[PDB]
Write an enzyme that holds these catalytic residues in place. Structure first.
Site, PDB file in Angstrom:
ATOM      1  N   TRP A  80      46.037  36.554  24.066  1.00 41.10           N
ATOM      2  CA  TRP A  80      46.736  36.754  25.336  1.00 41.10           C
ATOM      3  C   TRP A  80      47.935  35.824  25.512  1.00 41.10           C
ATOM      4  CZ3 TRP A  80      45.286  41.189  27.264  1.00 41.10           C
ATOM      5  CH2 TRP A  80      43.966  41.631  27.069  1.00 41.10           C
ATOM      6  N   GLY A 114      48.355  39.082  33.996  1.00 42.50           N
ATOM      7  CA  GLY A 114      48.418  37.654  33.731  1.00 42.50           C
ATOM      8  C   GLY A 114      48.422  36.843  35.012  1.00 42.50           C
ATOM      9  N   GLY A 115      47.830  37.406  36.060  1.00 44.00           N
ATOM     10  CA  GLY A 115      47.690  36.728  37.334  1.00 44.00           C
ATOM     11  C   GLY A 115      49.005  36.316  37.964  1.00 44.00           C
ATOM     12  N   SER A 196      45.487  44.654  35.597  1.00 46.16           N
ATOM     13  CA  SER A 196      45.309  43.452  36.407  1.00 46.16           C
ATOM     14  C   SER A 196      46.517  43.195  37.325  1.00 46.16           C
ATOM     15  CB  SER A 196      44.985  42.246  35.523  1.00 46.16           C
ATOM     16  OG  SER A 196      44.350  41.233  36.271  1.00 46.16           O
ATOM     17  N   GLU A 323      34.058  43.275  34.668  1.00 49.21           N
ATOM     18  CA  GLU A 323      35.319  42.623  35.026  1.00 49.21           C
ATOM     19  C   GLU A 323      35.191  41.115  35.187  1.00 49.21           C
ATOM     20  OE1 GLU A 323      38.268  43.879  35.200  1.00 49.21           O
ATOM     21  OE2 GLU A 323      38.055  46.054  35.512  1.00 49.21           O
ATOM     22  N   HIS A 436      36.971  42.463  31.293  1.00 50.18           N
ATOM     23  CA  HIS A 436      38.307  42.544  31.856  1.00 50.18           C
ATOM     24  C   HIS A 436      39.343  42.483  30.742  1.00 50.18           C
ATOM     25  CE1 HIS A 436      41.498  41.854  34.779  1.00 50.18           C
ATOM     26  NE2 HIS A 436      41.876  40.773  34.111  1.00 50.18           N
TER      27      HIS A 436
HETATM   28  C1  LIG Z   1      46.575  38.535  30.852  1.00 49.54           C
HETATM   29  N1  LIG Z   1      45.203  39.023  30.639  1.00 49.54           N
HETATM   30  C2  LIG Z   1      44.885  40.343  30.993  1.00 49.54           C
HETATM   31  C3  LIG Z   1      43.596  40.819  30.802  1.00 49.54           C
HETATM   32  C4  LIG Z   1      42.633  39.980  30.259  1.00 49.54           C
HETATM   33  C5  LIG Z   1      42.977  38.678  29.920  1.00 49.54           C
HETATM   34  C6  LIG Z   1      44.268  38.212  30.123  1.00 49.54           C
HETATM   35  C7  LIG Z   1      44.552  36.901  29.765  1.00 49.54           C
HETATM   36  N2  LIG Z   1      43.476  36.251  29.291  1.00 49.54           N
HETATM   37  O1  LIG Z   1      43.632  34.860  28.880  1.00 49.54           O
HETATM   38  C8  LIG Z   1      42.336  34.247  28.770  1.00 49.54           C
HETATM   39  C9  LIG Z   1      41.890  33.832  30.020  1.00 49.54           C
HETATM   40  C10 LIG Z   1      40.826  34.478  30.642  1.00 49.54           C
HETATM   41  F1  LIG Z   1      40.221  35.523  30.034  1.00 49.54           F
HETATM   42  C11 LIG Z   1      40.387  34.047  31.887  1.00 49.54           C
HETATM   43  F2  LIG Z   1      39.356  34.676  32.487  1.00 49.54           F
HETATM   44  C12 LIG Z   1      41.005  32.967  32.511  1.00 49.54           C
HETATM   45  F3  LIG Z   1      40.588  32.552  33.702  1.00 49.54           F
HETATM   46  C13 LIG Z   1      42.063  32.319  31.890  1.00 49.54           C
HETATM   47  F4  LIG Z   1      42.674  31.269  32.482  1.00 49.54           F
HETATM   48  C14 LIG Z   1      42.498  32.750  30.647  1.00 49.54           C
HETATM   49  F5  LIG Z   1      43.472  32.147  30.093  1.00 49.54           F
HETATM   50  K   LIG Z   2      44.361  36.262  33.524  1.00 51.85           K
END
Ligand SMILES: C[n+]1ccccc1/C=N/OCc1c(F)c(F)c(F)c(F)c1F
Ligand SMILES: [K+]
Ligand SMILES: *[C@@H]1O[C@H](CO[C@H]2O[C@@H](C)[C@@H](O)[C@@H](O)[C@@H]2O)[C@@H](O[C@@H]2O[C@H](CO)[C@@H](O)[C@H](O)[C@H]2NC(C)=O)[C@H](O)[C@H]1NC(C)=O
Ligand SMILES: *[C@@H]1O[C@H](CO[C@H]2O[C@@H](C)[C@@H](O)[C@@H](O)[C@@H]2O)[C@@H](O[C@@H]2O[C@H](CO)[C@@H](O)[C@H](O)[C@H]2NC(C)=O)[C@H](O)[C@H]1NC(C)=O
Ligand SMILES: *[C@H]1O[C@H](CO[C@H]2O[C@@H](C)[C@@H](O)[C@@H](O)[C@@H]2O)[C@@H](O[C@@H]2O[C@H](CO)[C@@H](O)[C@H](O)[C@H]2NC(C)=O)[C@H](O)[C@H]1NC(C)=O
Ligand SMILES: *[C@H]1O[C@H](CO[C@H]2O[C@@H](C)[C@@H](O)[C@@H](O)[C@@H]2O)[C@@H](O[C@@H]2O[C@H](CO)[C@@H](O)[C@H](O)[C@H]2NC(C)=O)[C@H](O)[C@H]1NC(C)=O
Ligand SMILES: C[n+]1ccccc1/C=N/OCc1c(F)c(F)c(F)c(F)c1F
Ligand SMILES: *[C@@H]1O[C@H](CO)[C@@H](O)[C@H](O)[C@H]1NC(C)=O
Ligand SMILES: *[C@@H]1O[C@H](CO)[C@@H](O)[C@H](O)[C@H]1NC(C)=O
Ligand SMILES: *[C@@H]1O[C@H](CO)[C@@H](O)[C@H](O)[C@H]1NC(C)=O
Ligand SMILES: *[C@@H]1O[C@H](CO)[C@@H](O)[C@H](O)[C@H]1NC(C)=O
Ligand SMILES: *[C@@H]1O[C@H](CO)[C@@H](O)[C@H](O)[C@H]1NC(C)=O
Ligand SMILES: *[C@@H]1O[C@H](CO)[C@@H](O)[C@H](O)[C@H]1NC(C)=O
Ligand SMILES: *[C@@H]1O[C@H](CO)[C@@H](O)[C@H](O)[C@H]1NC(C)=O
Ligand SMILES: *[C@@H]1O[C@H](CO)[C@@H](O)[C@H](O)[C@H]1NC(C)=O
Ligand SMILES: [Ca+2]
Ligand SMILES: [Ca+2]
Ligand SMILES: [Ca+2]
Ligand SMILES: [Ca+2]
Ligand SMILES: [Ca+2]
Ligand SMILES: [Ca+2]
Ligand SMILES: [Ca+2]
Ligand SMILES: [Ca+2]
Ligand SMILES: [Cl-]
Ligand SMILES: [Cl-]
Ligand SMILES: [Cl-]
Ligand SMILES: [Cl-]
Ligand SMILES: [Cl-]
Ligand SMILES: [Cl-]
Ligand SMILES: [Cl-]
Ligand SMILES: [Cl-]
Ligand SMILES: [K+]
Ligand code: NA
Ligand code: NA
Ligand code: NA
Ligand code: NA
Lengths: 527, 527
Positions: A80, A114-115, A196, A323, A436
Site C-alpha cells: 500500500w 488511504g484515509g 475507502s 472490513e 478491507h
Molecule cells: C489505502 N488502503 C486501502 C485499502 C486497504 C489498505 C490501505 C492501506 N493500507 O495500509 C496498511 C494499513 C492498514 F491496513 C491499516 F488498517 C492501518 F490502520 C494503517 F495505518 C495502515 F497503514
Molecule cells: K488506510
C-alpha cells in the site's frame, strides 16, 4: 508508435503486452501546475500547455505523505506504500486505452483510498491494463493531494480553503471531459470508482455541483462520506489547523499570515507534525479530510443526502465481510498479525476505548452489550471477532448501507454487494478474513493473470466481477448476462436486497447487518 | 519432490525454473536457536534438531534493523531495505543447488553488507539461482544479527561479548561444513564472498582462527576490515554501550545488570536508540560493529594483518569507480539525487566537516589541497566529483588496496579488480556514476536474464564476471579461459597490477589511485 494530441500538447504513450493483445498506456500525464511555493494549499491551477512531446511512459511522483512502517518488510502492508518518489509535484494522471484504439469507449476513473492521508494511483493493484484489455474500457487514475497539503482548512480563506485534494480529482475529471475523445473515449460515458476514502470522494462528487457534469455514474467500494472518519467538522478543521500552526512555529494573528508561514516550511516539517494535531487519534483517524468549504461542498453533506440534493444517476455500492480486522493490529491491545489474537473480555473493552476515544462508559457498554450475544457458543475467538465486527460495522458497512438507502429513496437504481471471498494469496493471517481493501485486486482483474498463483475459481470470480463493473459503467446495470449468473436486483429501501460475491454459493439476500446497523445508525448517535 | 536429510533433520526445498533448466532452492533453513530472551546479545547457540520435515520454501525473517527512509518510494534506495518481516528470530540460511544434483560442487557463501547495521540475504540482487544454474556451483547465504543486537560490546563479559553477528556467520559456515555434502556440495571447496561490510566480514574470517578451516578462499567486494568504518575501538564500544544503556533507562552499576535490563526492552526501543549513541555520526557511521573481543578476534586486526597472522590462501579483491557518491546524498550540503549536485568550494568544505567530523582544520585543508589540483580544467563539477572521490578513496578503495598489498606480501596469490561499468538500469542519477553496491547484480548474474532490460553488452560482462568468480572459487584463479579474455595477473606489492572490468576496453593497469592512497594510507593518519 503512439502519440495523442491533447488540448495542452502532444503526449507519447507506450505499448503493453497483456493477454496476447496490446494495451496502450499513458503514465504520468500532468493535469495541473505543480502546487508549489505560493501554490501550496491552494486549489489546483490549470496547465500551462506545451509544444514538443510529453513522454507519458512511467508513473509520476506520488503526493507527499507519511508511510506506514508498522511492519517493515511485510508485503501485506508494504503493498500500500507509494512506489514512486514522494513530491509536492504530484498532480498527474494515467490513461489505459485498448488496442486497437477504441471507437467510443466507456471510461472508468479510479480514485484511490488511504484515509485522505495516504495513497497513490501507481499501486500494482490499481493497474488498469487488464480492464482495458478484457472489457475494452478506458481506465483513468489520478494522484491527488492528501494530508495537510491536500485538506488543510481555514474555511472561506482562499489561501487555504479546504478540499484541495477533492478539487485535484475534480480537475482531473475535467481533463477527461476535455481530452478523452482524442484517446477514443466517450466523455458522455464516464464512471467513477474508488475504494475507502476514494469511495467517500466518489460519494462527495455525487453531492458537488461542480462535478455533476464531469461523470455519468458511480461505484463506491467500502466507503461513503457519511462514514464517521470521512468528514472533518469545522471545529475540528480549525483546531487542527491552528495546532499544526503552533507545532511548526507558525502561530500568527492574521490567519492569512499563518498560511504563508506554513508555505515556507519543508513538506517534511508539515508531514512530521500532522500526526499530532489530534490529541487522541484512532487507527482510523483522518487528521485532515473533507470539510464543508462552501465551494466543493455547499452544505453539510448529511443534510444534502437527506433532502435529495445530489446527482441523479445509478450507483453500485458494497463492502467486504471483514472490513474492521485490518485496523485491529494497528493499536488494539492483544492483537497481532503473527498470532491468532485470541483476546479476553477486558482486552475487548480496552480495544473499544481505543476505537471510541471520546465515548461514555454507557456508550461503550452498549456496544459491548449489542455485540456479545454469543451465538450461542463460548468459542475463544468470541471477543476477537466481535471487535472486528464492531470496527467494520461502525466505520464502513452501516454507513454504506445507510448511504445506499437514502440515495435510492430519490428514485435511482442502486446495487449493493457483499464481497466475502478471501484471496488465496492474502499475506495476512487467516483470522483477519475477507479484509478491507482486498476486493480491489478482483475488481482490477489481477486474478485474470494465470501466471500469478490465484486459483481457477478466483479467475472465474474476477472475470465475473470485471464484467459486472464494466456492464455497470457502460449500461448502468451490473449483470453478467451470459454465464447463468445470479441476477443482481436493485436495492430498494423496502426489501434492501443485495448480492453476495464469492467463489462458491453466490446469492441474493436482504437487510445486511439489520440489527447491527439500527444500533449504529439509530441508537449510537444519541449516546 | 526434493527432501534432504541434514544433521538436524529433513528439510524440503522447491524447484525453480531458471534458463530452461532447474535449480533447487532451500530458503530459510534454521542454523541456530533463535537468539531471544536470555539469548539476546549472546553468541548463537546450536540447533535443537527436529523430526518431521522443515519446509524451506520461503525466505525467512530478516534480522531487526532500522530502515533507510530518506527516499520513500524510490527504487534506488528501497531495493536495499529488508523484504521479509523483521524479527529477532532471524538466524536462517539459504541454499541453491544445481539440477540435477551436483556430484561434488564448489560452494559460494554470500555475506551481505549494510554497515553492520542493516542487511538481509533475501534481497533480489543476492539471488543465488543464476549462479547455481549457470556455473553449477552451490550458493549459500545467511542472515546474521546487526546493529546493537549483533555487535553490542562489553568485552570479556559473555552476556554481551561483542562480534555476535560475526559468530552468526561463523556458525552458518559450520553448518555448511557439516551439511553441504548432503546437498551435493564439497565442504573442502568453500569460497566466501561479500560486499562492503560483508567483505569486511570476509577479511575478518581470514583473521579469525575459529574460521580458518570453515572455508577455502575469499572474495572481497568494496570492503575490508581496515576500512575506517569497519572496526569499533574498545573506547568507542564501551562508550556506545553505556550510552545505549542511559538512553533506554538501563544504566546500572554491575555491567552484567545493564545487559539484563537491556534484555528486557523491546527490540524497537533498542533500535530507536542506537542512532544516538554517537554524538556526531557520519553517513558512513557504524554505531555497533566488530570489536577486538579476544575470541573471534584475538588482537587488533591491523597488527594481525601486518605480522602475517591470517589464513594463507588466495583472495580476489576489488572496488568500484565511484564508491563514494552514494553517501553524498545522505548528508552532504548541496547534494541531491534529483539534480546534478554542482557544489561550490564552500560546500565542498562543509561536506568535509560532515565526513571527517573530528578532524583538524589543517587535516581538512590537506584533503582540500590534495584533491583540488584541477585537471587542468575549471569545470563546474570539479568540487562535486572531488568530494565523491574523497569519500570513496578514504572509505573503500585505499583500504582495499592496502589490505591486498599486505596480504600478498606473505606469498599468496591475490587478484584485484576495478569495476567501472554503470548499470544501464541504475535508478540513481548520472553524476553518481559507477556506484557502491552496483557490481553485485553483475556478480550474481542478473543481466543473464534477457527478460530484464539489461543491454547485450551487459549480459556479456555479467557472463564473463560470473565465470571469473566461479573459476576463482573452483580453482583459485579468476580467468575466463575461453573467449579471448584479457588475462588477470596476480597483484604483487611491487607492480600492483589490477584488472579493469567494463563493457568496452578491458585491461591491466598498475597502482590504482597511487597518489590518493599515499595521502590516505601514509599521510592522513598522522593528522
Ligand atoms: C489505502 N488502503 C486501502 C485499502 C486497504 C489498505 C490501505 C492501506 N493500507 O495500509 C496498511 C494499513 C492498514 F491496513 C491499516 F488498517 C492501518 F490502520 C494503517 F495505518 C495502515 F497503514
Ligand atoms: K488506510
Ligand atoms: C499475540 O501477540 C500479541 C502482540 O505482541 C506480541 O507479539 C508476539 C508475536 C510476541 O512477539 C510478543 O513478544 C509480542 O509482544 C501479544 O500481546 C502482547 O503481550 C505481551 C506480553 O504480556 C505484552 O507485553 C504486550 O503489551 C502485548 N502486545 C499487545 C499488542 O497488546 C499477545 O499476548 C499474543 N497472544 C497470543 C499468543 O494469542
Ligand atoms: C540541488 O538540490 C539540493 C537539495 O535540496 C533541494 O532539492 C531540490 C530538488 C529542490 O526540491 C529544493 O527545494 C531542495 O531543498 C539543493 O540544495 C538545497 O538548497 C536549498 C535552497 O537554498 C537549501 O535551503 C537547502 O539547504 C539545500 N539542501 C541541501 C541538501 O543542501 C541545491 O541547491 C540544488 N542545486 C542545483 C540545482 O544544483
Ligand atoms: C484542540 O486544541 C487543543 C490543542 O492541544 C493540542 O496541541 C497540539 C500541539 C498537540 O500536541 C495535542 O497533543 C494537544 O492536545 C487540544 O488540547 C487541549 O487544549 C487545552 C486548552 O483548551 C490545552 O491546555 C491542552 O494543551 C490540551 N489538553 C488536553 C488534556 O488535551 C484540544 O483537545 C482540541 N480541541 C478540540 C478537539 O476542539
Ligand atoms: C561518549 O560519552 C558521552 C555521552 O554523551 C552522549 O550521550 C548520549 C545519550 C547521546 O545522546 C549523545 O548525543 C551524547 O553526546 C559523549 O558526550 C559528551 O560527554 C560529556 C561528558 O564527558 C557530557 O557532558 C555530554 O553529554 C557530551 N558533550 C558533548 C558536547 O558531546 C562523549 O562525546 C563520548 N565519548 C567518547 C566518544 O569516547
Ligand atoms: C547494504 N548496501 C550495500 C551496497 C550498497 C547499498 C547498500 C544499502 N544502501 O541503502 C541506501 C543507502 C545508501 F546508499 C547510503 F549511501 C546510505 F548512507 C544509507 F544510509 C542508505 F540507506
Ligand atoms: C521520449 O521517448 C523517445 C523514445 O523513447 C525519445 O527518443 C524522446 O527523445 C523522448 N523524450 C525525452 C526523453 O524527453
Ligand atoms: C459516443 O456516444 C455518445 C452517446 O453516449 C454519442 O452522442 C457520441 O456522438 C458518440 N461519439 C462517437 C460515436 O464517436
Ligand atoms: C492579513 O494580512 C493580509 C496580507 O497583507 C492583508 O490582506 C490583511 O490586511 C490582513 N488582515 C488583517 C486582519 O489585518
Ligand atoms: C463465460 O464462460 C466462459 C467459459 O465457460 C468463460 O471463458 C468466460 O470468460 C465467461 N465469462 C464471464 C464474464 O464470466
Ligand atoms: C510442507 O509443504 C507440503 C507441500 O507444499 C505440505 O503438504 C506439508 O504438509 C508442508 N508442511 C507444513 C505446511 O508445515
Ligand atoms: C570432492 O573433492 C575433494 C577434494 O577437494 C575430495 O577429497 C572428496 O573426496 C570429493 N568428494 C566426492 C568425490 O564426493
Ligand atoms: C554482578 O551481578 C551478577 C549477577 O548476580 C553476579 O554474578 C556478580 O556477583 C555481580 N558483580 C558485582 C561486581 O557485584
Ligand atoms: C563465450 O562465447 C560464447 C559466444 O561467443 C558465449 O555464448 C559464452 O557464454 C561465452 N562465455 C563466457 C564465459 O563469456
Ligand atoms: Ca515530501
Ligand atoms: Ca456526463
Ligand atoms: Ca457474516
Ligand atoms: Ca453464480
Ligand atoms: Ca524488530
Ligand atoms: Ca576448507
Ligand atoms: Ca577513474
Ligand atoms: Ca576482454
Ligand atoms: Cl476526522
Ligand atoms: Cl464488566
Ligand atoms: Cl426480510
Ligand atoms: Cl448479518
Ligand atoms: Cl565506528
Ligand atoms: Cl579557503
Ligand atoms: Cl608503474
Ligand atoms: Cl587514478
Ligand atoms: K550501507
Ligand atoms: Na515500503
Ligand atoms: Na494482495
Ligand atoms: Na522499503
Ligand atoms: Na539495480
Amino acid at each position: 508508435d503512439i502519440i495523442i494530441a491533447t488540448k495542452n500538447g502532444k503526449v507519447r504513450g507506450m505499448q503493453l503486452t497483456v493477454f496476447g493483445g496490446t494495451v496502450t498506456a499513458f503514465l504520468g500525464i500532468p493535469y495541473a501546475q505543480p502546487p508549489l511555493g505560493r501554490l501550496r494549499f491552494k486549489k489546483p491551477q490549470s496547465l500551462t500547455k506545451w509544444s514538443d512531446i510529453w513522454n507519458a511512459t512511467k508513473y509520476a511522483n506520488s503526493c507527499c505523505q507519511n508511510i506506514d512502517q508498522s511492519f517493515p518488510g511485510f508485503h501485506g502492508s508494504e503493498m500500500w506504500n507509494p512506489n514512486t518518489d514522494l513530491s509536492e509535484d504530484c498532480l498527474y494522471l494515467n490513461v489505459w486505452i485498448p488496442a486497437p484504439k477504441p471507437k467510443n469507449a466507456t471510461v472508468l476513473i479510479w480514485i484511490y483510498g488511504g484515509g485522505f492521508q495516504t495513497g497513490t494511483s501507481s499501486l500494482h493493484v490499481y493497474d488498469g491494463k487488464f480492464l482495458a484489455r478484457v472489457e475494452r474500457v478506458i481506465v483513468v487514475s489520478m494522484n491527488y493531494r492528501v494530508g495537510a497539503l491536500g485538506f488543510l482548512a481555514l474555511p472561506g480563506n482562499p489561501e487555504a480553503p479546504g478540499n484541495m485534494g477533492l478539487f485535484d480529482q475534480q480537475l482531473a475529471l475535467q481533463w477527461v471531459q476535455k481530452n478523452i475523445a482524442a484517446f477514443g473515449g466517450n466523455p458522455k460515458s464516464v464512471t467513477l470508482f474508488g475504494e475507502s476514502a476514494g469511495a467517500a470522494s466518489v460519494s462527495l462528487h455525487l453531492l458537488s455541483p461542480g462535478s455533476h457534469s464531469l461523470f455519468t455514474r458511480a461505484i463506491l467500494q467500502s466507503g461513503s462520506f457519511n462514514a464517521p472518519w470521512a468528514v472533518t467538522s469545522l471545529y475540528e478543521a480549525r483546531n487542527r489547523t491552528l495546532n499544526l500552526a503552533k507545532l511548526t512555529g507558525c502561530s500568527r494573528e492574521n490567519e492569512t499570515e499563518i498560511i504563508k508561514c506554513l508555505r515556507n516550511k519543508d513538506p517534511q516539517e508539515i508531514l512530521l507534525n500532522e500526526a499530532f494535531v489530534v490529541p487522541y487519534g484512532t487507527p482510523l483517524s483522518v487528521n485532515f479530510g473533507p470539510t464543508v468549504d462552501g465551494d466543493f461542498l455547499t452544505d453539510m453533506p448529511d443534510i444534502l443526502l437527506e433532502l435529495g440534493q445530489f446527482k441523479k444517476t445509478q450507483i453500485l455500492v458494497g463492502v467486504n465481510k471483514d472490513e474492521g480486522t485490518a485496523f485491529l493490529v494497528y493499536g488494539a491491545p492483544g492483537f497481532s498479525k503473527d498470532n491468532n489474537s485470541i483476546i479476553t473480555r477486558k482486552e475487548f473493552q480496552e480495544g473499544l476505548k481505543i476505537f471510541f476515544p471520546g465515548v461514555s462508559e454507557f456508550g461503550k457498554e452498549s456496544i459491548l452489550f449489542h455485540y456479545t450475544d454469543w451465538v450461542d457458543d463460548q468459542r475463544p475467538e468470541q471477543y476477537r471477532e466481535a471487535l472486528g465486527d464492531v470496527v467494520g460495522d461502525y466505520n464502513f458497512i452501516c454507513p454504506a448501507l445507510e448511504f445506499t438507502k437514502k440515495f435510492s429513496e430519490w428514485g435511482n437504481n442502486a446495487f449493493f454487494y457483499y464481497f466475502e471471498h478471501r484471496s488465496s494469496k492474502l499475506p495476512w493471517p487467516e483470522w483477519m478474513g475477507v479484509m478491507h481493501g482486498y476486493e480491489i485486486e478482483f475488481v482490477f482483474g489481477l486474478p485474470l493473470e494465470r501466471r500469478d498463483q490465484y486459483t481457477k475459481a478466483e479467475e472465474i470470480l474476477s472475470r465475473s466481477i470485471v464484467k459486472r463493473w464494466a456492464n455497470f459503467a457502460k449500461y448502468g446495470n451490473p449483470q453478467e448476462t451470459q454465464n447463468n449468473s445470479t441476477s443482481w436486483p436493485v436495492f430498494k429501501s423496502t426489501e434492501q436486497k443485495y448480492l453476495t460475491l464469492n467463489t462458491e454459493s453466490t446469492r441474493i439476500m436482504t437487510k445486511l447487518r439489520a440489527q447491527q446497523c439500527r444500533f449504529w445508525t439509530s441508537f449510537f448517535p444519541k449516546v
